[PDB]
A paper describes a structure:
The importin [name] transports [name]-[name] into the yeast nucleus, where RanGTP facilitates histone release. [name] and [name] contain disordered N- and C-terminal tails and central alpha helices that fold together into the globular [name]-[name] histone-fold domain, with very basic surfaces that bind DNA in the nucleosome. These same surfaces are shielded when [name]-[name] binds the Sc [name] dimer (Nap12), which is mostly localized to the yeast cytoplasm where it chaperones newly synthesized and folded [name]-[name]. The mode of [name]-[name] recognition by [name]/IMP9 is well understood: the superhelical [name] wraps around the [name]-[name] histone-fold domain, occluding the histone’s DNA-binding surfaces and functioning as a histone chaperone. Here, biochemical and structural analyses show that [name], [name]-[name], and a [name] dimer (Nap12) associate in the absence and presence of RanGTP to form equimolar complexes.
[name] alone is a mixture of dimers and tetramers, while [name] binds [name]-[name] to form a mixture of a [name] dimer (Nap12) bound to one [name]-[name] (Nap12•[name]-[name]) and larger [name]/[name]-[name] assemblies. For comparison, we also performed cryo-EM analysis with a mixture of [name], Nap12, and excess [name]-[name] without RanGTP, which produced a heterogenous mixture of particles that included unliganded Nap12, the binary [name]•[name]-[name] complex, and small populations of two different assemblies containing [name], Nap12, and [name]-[name].
Author numbering:
A (entry chain E): 83 to 365
B (entry chain D): 81 to 365
Write the structure that this text describes.
């Protein structure tokens, strides 16, 4: 205030500082573009590792002796001696071992250990998550900057929906939010092609067969009511803000905070750290 | 669950070991990514250097704004709300001879630090007295030698009465390996020895003097005593370790002092200097 009340030398110097602030903001925009470029570059390196562990998880690929030995040495260095093999386990025959190809409930176990997301999982969700093979992540290059999430389900054996893959998208605002980070814009996601309502874990179901007391027509009914589930992660909050959504926008904002927290958790912890979160060592 | 872990078939344990190996490879990739980020950040620090130097010249009064920069600032003021800078008729009547009697921006950096939440707690009035002579706050990235960043504080020896050092700097150091989350993690920090002009001006100590005809020792003797005290300039001379005392005393020392010190260093580096102006006016809050 008084700095404005100070002579126009001080005001004019502040004006120059603000012009330099705008120029610095331009340099900052350049830096942000550069760091997203670098992040994409190294995400291309992340993807092979994540896909490899996903193939191991689903059982689509097998380990190798050198990898097992390296993990042995690392675990001994980690002090997490629980993973260590014992002779009683060695006694198991191959016929006993191959009864399951992938790690049972790998992701479900990992998501159960993960702090916030585990609260979202219901029993039917847990059963569904058993068919979850992989979680993949991607960055949005066009238009608004943002990052996208992918899940792969073995839809062939999945009894609940035909969606081979589900994708979830996040958006950021146009300009650099203050403090030189990117702040969120609303999110969008897929809709699930449930095979039927009984198998729809986002829904609880009622069956009714009736003869209408008013018209005396004969009818059989299939009825639906939505419920909370891990897959409420999809059907994300509709819009950041719009005139018709305001009453919805209350829930959209709250669920947006929660869903951004969930996605941030996935992005930083789970997809970059899966093994420890499965084993619980990440706790 | 230990029981479930035991239940894991030997094949499943082998697969888990392979997965942990993959996680280690991921940590290696994260190391490479952090190296690239550090180098790019150094490059854009080089690009920031001109603008920061120019604003420093403006702050010190060594340079005067041009009408072009003035008009651009006026436009940016018309944007959002900064009409505090819109110059009024009463000021245009003034003359540079009257205005330039105060050259530069009084207490620009001291004001900037005080608005900064965490660090301002450490600054005392005795520290503050030095900070009016602060006219620059600079960053350096320790590309050579141990990784980390160094902070630079500048003064005028001919102006300040406290020390003969034109520049005071603080340093922070990282471990050779990344943290678990993939971010950088810390090593012991170090600070400069302040070349105080005299102990009386020195602000990291409180002193007392006595004189005794000590019959207990039959000594006509003069004595001096020095006590460390709390002050922001304790931000320099950070803690160090000695093995035996380390595990009892410096364990808690490292638990507390290092946490506060790293928090303050990162807060300066990230929040303050890139927004050196908004923090001074307070808009950066």
């Amino acid at each position: 205030g008084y700095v404005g009340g100070l002579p126009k030398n001080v005001k004019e110097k502040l004006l120059s500082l603000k012009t330099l602030q705008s120029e610095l903001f331009e340099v900052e925009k350049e830096f942000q573009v550069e760091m997203f470029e670098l992040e994409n570059k190294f995400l291309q390196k992340y993807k092979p590792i994540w896909e490899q562990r996903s193939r191991i998880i689903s059982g689509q690929e097998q380990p190798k002796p050198e990898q097992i030995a390296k993990g042995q040495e690392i675990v001994e260095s980690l002090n997490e001696t629980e993973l260590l093999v014992d002779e009683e386990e060695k006694a198991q025959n191959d016929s006993e071992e191959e009864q399951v190809k992938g790690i049972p409930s790998f992701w479900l176990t990992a998501l159960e250990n993960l702090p916030i997301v585990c609260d979202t999982i219901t029993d039917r969700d847990a059963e569904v998550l058993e068919y979850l093979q992989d979680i993949g992540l991607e960055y949005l290059t066009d238009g608004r900057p943002g990052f996208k999430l992918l899940f792969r389900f073995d839809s062939s054996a999945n009894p609940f929906f035909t969606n081979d893959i589900l994708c979830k998208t996040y958006f950021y605002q146009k300009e650099l939010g203050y403090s030189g980070d990117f702040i969120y814009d609303h999110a969008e996601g897929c809709e699930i092609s449930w095979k039927d309502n009984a198998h729809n874990v986002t829904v609880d179901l009622e069956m009714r067969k009736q003869r209408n007391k008013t018209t005396k027509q004969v009818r059989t009914i299939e009825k639906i009511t939505p419920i909370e589930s891990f897959f409420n992660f999809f059907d994300p909050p509709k819009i950041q803000n719009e005139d018709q959504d305001e009453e919805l926008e209350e829930d959209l904002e709250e669920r947006l905070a929660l869903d951004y927290s969930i996605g941030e958790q996935l992005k930083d912890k789970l997809i970059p750290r899966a093994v420890d979160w499965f084993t619980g060592a990440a706790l």
